[PDB]
């Protein structure tokens, strides 16, 4: 139940990715723009569905308290395998089952915290168990569970 100041800051940083204009609410339009920047192409009906599921009052947008309520509860879910696969799909935008340095760099630039190109190479190398220069799904699961 207990949330730390650091956990709240982490959830705030996740919220700020979707609130493109920084005005305090996530709109359906912003959600679509961010999803497409992460290589996905949701339908307008899917976008409206996602807003409605998080929007606790009726006003049609997501504010941070609504976002935090959903994320703090998700922190107590046990389906870790499904969440890690969703993260894998964010990186693996071409769906070939392997994350390249270029795919990692692309996600990095969209999500905020900057990594140098040397750090991108290092992150790939340290997860690349079999040494083909890319991160497959089973390597990614081990990376994300450490």
């Amino acid at each position: 139940d207990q949330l730390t100041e650091e956990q709240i800051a982490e959830f705030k940083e996740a919220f700020s990715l979707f609130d493109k204009d920084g005005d305090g609410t996530i709109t359906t339009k912003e959600l679509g723009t961010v999803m497409r920047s992460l290589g996905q192409n949701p339908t307008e009906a899917e976008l409206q569905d996602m807003i409605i599921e998080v929007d606790a009052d009726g006003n049609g947008t997501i504010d941070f308290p609504e976002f935090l309520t959903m994320m703090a509860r998700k922190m107590k879910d046990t389906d870790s395998e499904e969440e890690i696969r969703e993260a894998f799909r964010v990186f693996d935008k071409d769906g070939n089952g392997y994350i390249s340095a270029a795919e990692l760099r692309h996600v990095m630039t969209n999500l905020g915290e900057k990594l140098t190109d040397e750090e991108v190479d290092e992150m790939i190398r340290e997860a690349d168990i079999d040494g083909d220069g890319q991160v497959n799904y089973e390597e990614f699961v081990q990376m994300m569970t450490a």
């Binding site: 940083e13 599921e53 996600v107 999500l111």
Partner: peptide, 28 residues
């Protein structure tokens, strides 16, 4: 539910991975 919630939580998990990586690398 898990489909919608999962997209938002996935970006958190990725941001956390990057943040922990950078913090550990620069640990004094």
């Amino acid at each position: 539910d898990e489909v919608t919630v999962g997209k938002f939580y996935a970006t958190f998990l990725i941001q956390e991975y990057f943040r922990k990586f950078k913090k550990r690398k620069e640990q004094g």
